[PDB]
Design a protein around this ligand. Structure first.
Ligand SMILES: CCCCCCCCCCCCCCCCCC(=O)OC[C@H](COP(=O)([O-])OCC[N+](C)(C)C)OC(=O)CCCCCCCCCCCCCCCCC
Ligand SMILES: CCCCCCCCCCCCCCCCCC(=O)OC[C@H](COP(=O)([O-])OCC[N+](C)(C)C)OC(=O)CCCCCCCCCCCCCCCCC
Ligand SMILES: CCCCCCCCCCCCCCCCCC(=O)OC[C@H](COP(=O)([O-])OCC[N+](C)(C)C)OC(=O)CCCCCCCCCCCCCCCCC
Ligand SMILES: CCCCCCCCCCCCCCCCCC(=O)OC[C@H](COP(=O)([O-])OCC[N+](C)(C)C)OC(=O)CCCCCCCCCCCCCCCCC
Lengths: 382, 382
């Protein structure tokens, strides 16, 4: 990669570090004292997750470059002009600079007129303008490819399902915090926000929104079967996402009938518990045995894993498996707490702590799924 | 292709940028009108100009390797272990981060311990600690080379004379102000300071030390004459540097008699004026005729330049010449004002603005003097 790309990577990383430190210092000592900044958090976290996601994705590319598995051919990208890890770090650093500047603007509102509202709006609007921009400024091929994929994924099962479409729809299942907080921003600006004089911060459908990343995968797998006529792995995956469907549904039912009479709420709680267990076990075993391709009985050495090991040492696998076993339950409880008022106490703190763990599990799952899709060719994309 | 080194260069550049922005924003946010920044800036500009010179020298090395300058053959040096512009950039950025941290700590003073006046010394000590430390690291070879040339430069003709020591001594003329800064530090830390308060302030020897960079070159020219028994240009150069002695002498006399109010005050003024004029024109013609080797007869299509320009555009040279014809005068004016007490009003801003301009003039002067030396060997170093 050219030296100027690395220079911009370093510049953006250093600005990111300094802005992180000054955000910590500003948020710990003198920001508002008594503000209850929690709504602000919900506005920013998902966007931050995106930055984090991109950052993590860059590392993944590095691995997929150092392992050099198939990344050019699996995603069916162009054989030339493919983004490297440094380019992902560049974009992530630019977005992090914008995010930190918006956060500092929120904490230092006297920076300009039109306080508060515009800054998160400005950040996300700038991220959208960078995304959809036919001016062909910088990496226009990448942004256009992402735009084309989003239509093929976020819309419906009408489109053909490919590896890239499946991958994006799948990792939306882990960064769906942004989808939740987008509707949260809409509602908060609509109703919760004072939005009358200045600096106003006061010192049902969400269940549907939570299932959109699950609905997309369910209908994608249904389309896969409809054009496949051979549901060896497909209906299993549909059941896997229907477990999330049921867990979200009964979480919503419990949070609705807890405070509205209906003393049979203990039945809903037991159903929630059993569906939590079922979804966690289903997703975990699907990841371990058939998604990552581990636990292969044909393997002779390096038990609990498969015959062929791309990565340098088996130590990366067992720690990852333990962390994934923890983070599967983390995600399972997260997508239930963020959906509705399951836990009146805390919850938001839990959601903010747990979301980066979901993106972390995505970061390792990308490694393992991509390195699995070189020999087994799961999903038969070929 | 030092990719990680380029990354570190960018990281340090970004941290320095954000720290400088924080400095400029805290200067107009914190501090009080009755607490003038003049002591703090008179302490810190010594390191500020050092960092500026180091970064400009990195640019100088980059430009030298860009087109036609070989600052290895005639620079002493080793043709296999030279410092590149990346390394100079990294060193400048590292010292800039340390300087910015020191200045910010002096601005805020988060803790009642480690008084404000302790922060600069450590940095300067750290600067010394980057050279005197014998641990073979941090480009130990270059640090040892610098400390082995700071002896051949800062001493008397007891040593020999070459290109490297002559150049290092010449840079001292542009860096004379920081020497005064060091002097000021001592005068700050010996005579006027309230050691019982953590705040940094309260709401003829200098004229001699000012000539030290001039003496180190005058006596070195005399050494060259004693060696080669060559009248021109060694004695001409000696006169050019003794013009500094004459200028400072008459400026000091005029200022001293101005405050003392004696009848011989006005007589020295015209002598100071004429010596200023002759000194400025002397250094000017030395720069534009023998330093840079311009105004050459039968040079060719080049206007006012010599036969060989090497550098891409002719316009550069003309700009340089114009800037030189300005900056030298400012430079000479600076020598008048910083040292002697003449016209205490203003001057401080004059010094703090013209000193970086002096370093910029030295930057261009390094750009062209080494070119002249490479093209037509001057100072008889062949
Ligand atoms: C070291 C002590 C202090 C540590 C402080 C930080 C610790 C906290 C944990 C950070 C983990 C960082 C891991 C990723 C970086 C290394 C990845 C890698 O493979 O690099 C090798 C890569 C590639 O290595 P390479 O180029 O040597 O490999 C090929 C070289 N040849 C061809 C010659 C063989 O390194 C680079 O040169 C790339 C650019 C620099 C490394 C990227 C750093 C970016 C840091 C961004 C941070 C902030 C932005 C986003 C943050 C968002 C989250 C909030
Ligand atoms: C409305 C809600 C929207 C929610 C989702 C928002 C977008 C989420 C995107 C997640 C994945 C992003 C990276 C995927 C591709 C990277 C992996 C890879 O190696 O592929 C190479 C690809 C292609 O790069 P390439 O250089 O290899 O190109 C290949 C060459 N062609 C195209 C000819 C085949 O890399 C990318 O596309 C990455 C660059 C784009 C990164 C995103 C830009 C900024 C993100 C802002 C998103 C908007 C947030 C919305 C906020 C609220 C809106 C109201
Ligand atoms: C007592 C008064 C002290 C006054 C000190 C004035 C400043 C001295 C340091 C600045 C001059 C150095 C740059 C000029 C030479 C560059 C030549 C070149 O291109 O080669 C690169 C040279 C060597 O290049 P190289 O290593 O690539 O070449 C190979 C060399 N040999 C032959 C040995 C293999 O390296 C440097 O100049 C960089 C070294 C770091 C310099 C800065 C260190 C930290 C700053 C502290 C300075 C002191 C501050 C004092 C403040 C007050 C203290 C009380
Ligand atoms: C944004 C505002 C710009 C103007 C503000 C005024 C300051 C000047 C800003 C920099 C102007 C250009 C300088 C570098 C010119 C190009 C050099 C080069 O080759 O770069 C390529 C290098 C990388 O090397 P490279 O190997 O890519 O070299 C390019 C040539 N090839 C590829 C063919 C070999 O890029 C950099 O890393 C440049 C660093 C940024 C510029 C300098 C800042 C860092 C060092 C100083 C830190 C701050 C302390 C001192 C600041 C001043 C006093 C307070």
């Amino acid at each position: 990669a050219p030296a100027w790309t690395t220079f911009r990577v370093g510049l953006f990383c250093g600005i990111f570090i300094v802005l992180n430190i000054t955000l910590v210092l500003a948020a710990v000592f003198k920001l508002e004292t008594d503000r209850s900044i929690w709504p602000l958090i919900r506005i920013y976290r998902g966007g931050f997750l995106l930055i984090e996601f991109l950052f993590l994705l860059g590392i993944n590319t590095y691995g997929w470059r150092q392992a050099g598995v198939n990344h050019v051919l699996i995603f069916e990208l162009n054989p030339r002009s493919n983004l490297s890890h440094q380019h992902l770090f560049e974009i992530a650093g630019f977005l992090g600079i914008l995010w930190c500047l918006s956060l500092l603007a929120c904490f230092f509102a006297p920076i300009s007129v039109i306080p508060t509202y515009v800054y998160p709006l400005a950040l996300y609007g700038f991220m959208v303008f960078f995304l959809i921009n036919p001016t062909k400024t910088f990496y226009y091929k990448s942004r256009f490819w992402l735009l084309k994929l989003l239509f093929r994924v976020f819309t419906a099962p009408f489109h053909k399902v490919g590896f890239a479409d499946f991958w994006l729809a799948d990792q939306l299942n882990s960064l769906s915090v942004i989808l939740m907080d987008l509707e949260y921003m809409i509602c908060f600006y609509s109703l919760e926000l004072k939005w009358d004089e200045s600096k106003g911060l006061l010192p049902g459908v969400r269940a549907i929104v939570q299932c959109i990343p699950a609905w997309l995968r369910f209908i994608q797998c249904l389309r896969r079967y409809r054009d496949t006529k051979r549901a060896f792995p497909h209906l299993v995956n549909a059941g896997k996402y229907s477990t999330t469907f049921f867990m979200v549904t009964f979480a919503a039912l419990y949070s609705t009938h807890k405070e509205r009479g209906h003393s049979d709420t203990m039945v809903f709680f037991y159903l929630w518990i059993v569906f939590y267990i079922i979804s966690s076990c289903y997703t975990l075993i699907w990841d371990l045995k058939m998604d990552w391709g581990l636990f292969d009985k044909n393997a002779g050495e390096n038990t609990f894993l498969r015959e062929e090991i791309v990565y340098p040492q088996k130590a990366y696998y067992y720690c990852a498996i333990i962390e994934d076993v923890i983070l599967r339950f983390a995600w399972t409880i997260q997508i239930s707490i963020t959906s509705t008022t399951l836990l009146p106490h805390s919850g938001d703190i839990i959601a903010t702590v747990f979301a980066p763990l979901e993106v972390f599990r995505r970061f390792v799952w990308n490694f393992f799924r991509l390195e699995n899709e070189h020999l087994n060719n799961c999903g038969e994309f070929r």
